């Protein structure tokens, strides 16, 4: 809020500005954008025009960061991606042509898929009624769910590793185990789902 409410967020996408001539409503729209004499917030240091940056990877990076260390958290992320990569290159050359067609070597797609699998469907909110606190099944927003996934990943691979064991190691492990749905993270997701079925009657207490 060193920006007045007048200031719009910038659009960093290069593809949007490069190829305008085929869209009428969007031409009209960004015409109205700049021509409105509209002020623009200065593009943040984290975000780049880079063809290489995944906003999800960056979010995760941030949620991993303790104190002020981007350098250290970006290190750990980088190392983890490299570790998943090399773990799958190991699993590729000791395999046979069929499994060489099957196995995924893109660490990015592995990260994404492993998060999609770990995100909860349904959730729980405490509701006070008649002086008692019941836990009630609540549908969740998308953002809340992605958040729950990432936070659960990091909480586990911070908490449950042996102190000798480094972070990118444990994290690459859990990424690959959650890729295949057998990870402890996924067990947590299921504990939620089961607690949500156990209480399904109480779904009536929710007024919204």
Partner 1 sequence: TVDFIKKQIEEFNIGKRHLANMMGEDPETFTQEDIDRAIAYLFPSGLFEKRARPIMKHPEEIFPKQRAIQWGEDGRPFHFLFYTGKQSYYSLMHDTYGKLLDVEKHHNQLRAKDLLAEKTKILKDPIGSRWLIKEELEEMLVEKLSDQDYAQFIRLLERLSALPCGATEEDFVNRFRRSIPIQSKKQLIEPLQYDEQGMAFSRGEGKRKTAKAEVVVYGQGSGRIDVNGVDYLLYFPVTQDREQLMFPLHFLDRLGKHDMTCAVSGGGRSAQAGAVRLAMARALCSFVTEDEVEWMRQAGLLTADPRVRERKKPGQEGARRKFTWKKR
Chain residues in the site for partner 1 (CB under 8 A): 2-3, 10-12, 14, 17, 30, 33-34, 37-43, 45-46, 48-50, 70-71, 74
Question: 66 touches which of RNA, partner 1, none (CB within 5 to 8 A by kind)?
Answer: RNA
| DSSP class of 42 | P
Q: Report d(CA 133, CA 120) in Å as an integer.
A: 22
Instruction: Considering only the stretches 2-10, 45-53, 105-113, 194-202, report the one whose residues sit in contact with RNA under the rule CB under 7 A.
Output: 2-10
- Could you say whether residue 130 binds RNA (CB under 7 A)? no
Cβ atoms of residues 206 and 127 within 8 Å:
yes
DSSP string, 119-179: S-SEEEEEEEETTEEEEEEEE--HHHHHHHHHHHHHHHHHHSS-TTS-HHHHHHHHHHHHH
- Could you say whether residue 1 binds RNA (CB under 7 A)? yes
Question: 126 touches which of RNA, partner 1, none (CB within 5 to 8 A by kind)?
Answer: RNA
- Could you say whether residue 36 binds RNA (CB under 7 A)? no
- Could you say whether residue 151 binds RNA (CB under 7 A)? yes
Q: Compare residues 155 and 198 and give the one whose CB is closer to RNA.
A: 155
Residues 6+ apart with CB under 8 A from 129: 205
Tokens of 183: 């990870």
- Give the three-state DSSP class for 20: coil
- Give the three-state DSSP class for 8: strand
Question: 10 touches which of partner 1, RNA, none (CB within 5 to 8 A by kind)?
Answer: partner 1
Q: Compare residues 34 and 207 and give the one whose CB is closer to RNA.
A: 207
Where in 50-89 is the site for RNA (CB under 7 A)? 63, 66
Tokens of 176: 């690959």
Contacts with RNA by CB under 7 A lie at 1-4, 6, 63, 66, 125-126, 147, 151, 163
């Amino acid at each position: 809020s060193r920006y007045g409410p007048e200031y719009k967020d910038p659009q960093i996408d290069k593809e949007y500005y490069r190829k305008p001539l085929a869209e009428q409503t969007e031409e009209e729209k960004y015409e109205r954008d700049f021509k409105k004499t509209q002020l623009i917030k200065a593009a943040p240091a984290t975000k780049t025009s880079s063809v290489f940056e995944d906003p999800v990877i960056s979010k995760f990076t941030n949620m991993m960061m303790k104190g002020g260390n981007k350098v250290l958290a970006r290190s750990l992320m980088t190392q983890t991606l490299e570790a998943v990569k090399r773990k799958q290159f190991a699993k590729y050359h000791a395999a046979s042509a069929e499994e060489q067609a099957t196995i995924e070597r893109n660490p990015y797609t592995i990260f994404h898929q492993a998060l999609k699998n770990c995100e909860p469907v349904i959730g729980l909110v405490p509701i006070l009624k008649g002086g008692h606190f019941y836990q009630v099944p609540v549908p969740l927003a998308d953002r809340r769910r992605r958040f729950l996934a990432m936070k659960w990943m990091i909480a586990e691979c911070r908490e449950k590793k042996h102190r000798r064991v480094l972070m990118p190691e444990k994290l690459s492990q859990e990424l690959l185990e959650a890729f295949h749905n057998q990870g402890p993270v996924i067990k947590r997701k299921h504990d939620m789902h089961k607690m949500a079925e156990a209480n399904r009657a109480l779904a009536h207490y929710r007024w919204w």
